[PDB]
From Swiss-Prot, chains A, B:
This protein is synthesized as a Gag-vJun chimeric protein. The sequence shown here corresponds to the Jun homolog fragment of the chimera. Residues 27-55 are annotated as: Leucine-zipper. This oncogene is the viral derivative of the AP-1 transcription factor. This is Viral jun-transforming protein. It is found in: Host nucleus. Residues 1-26 are annotated as: Basic motif. The chain holds residues 210 to 267 of 287 of the full protein. Residues 1-58 form the bZIP domain. It comes from Avian sarcoma virus (strain 17). Transmembrane segments: none annotated. Belongs to the bZIP family. Jun subfamily.
DNA sequence: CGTCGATGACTCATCGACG
DNA sequence: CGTCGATGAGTCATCGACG
């Protein structure tokens, strides 16, 4: 029937919306996680710049 | 009058879908640039270890 | 209260894939 | 060809904001 198809499409449409939100969430967690690493990597670089300017003494 | 509102809503729905897409594009751009920046900060940290392990000569 | 635009949910129009 | 599920678009339900 057309009633049955209309009902299968209602689930298809909600599944489509769902994985749109799922995609938004992965992307947002990805940038959250790259920001953390950015800061990790950038402070380390900083800690290593000081080790350089302190070893070039003597 | 029903017609006119139905038309104004068609435009609102279009605007809604478009800024969902604009949101996805900004999110993917952010990931792209944080990635490239990570690469930059990680190669730099790596080059700085080697200045350290070579200023470590005495 | 009615009316606005925004947005989630429902429905319709198409799509490519399948047989 | 008819039929499937996926997805963009149109439509309906409902929201908070306005006045």
């Amino acid at each position: 029937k057309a009633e049955r198809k209309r009902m299968r499409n209602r689930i298809a449409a909600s599944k489509s919306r769902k994985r749109k939100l799922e995609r938004i969430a992965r992307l947002e967690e990805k940038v959250k996680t790259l920001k953390a690493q950015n800061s990790e990597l950038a402070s380390t670089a900083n800690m290593l710049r000081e080790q350089v300017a302190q070893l070039k003494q003597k």
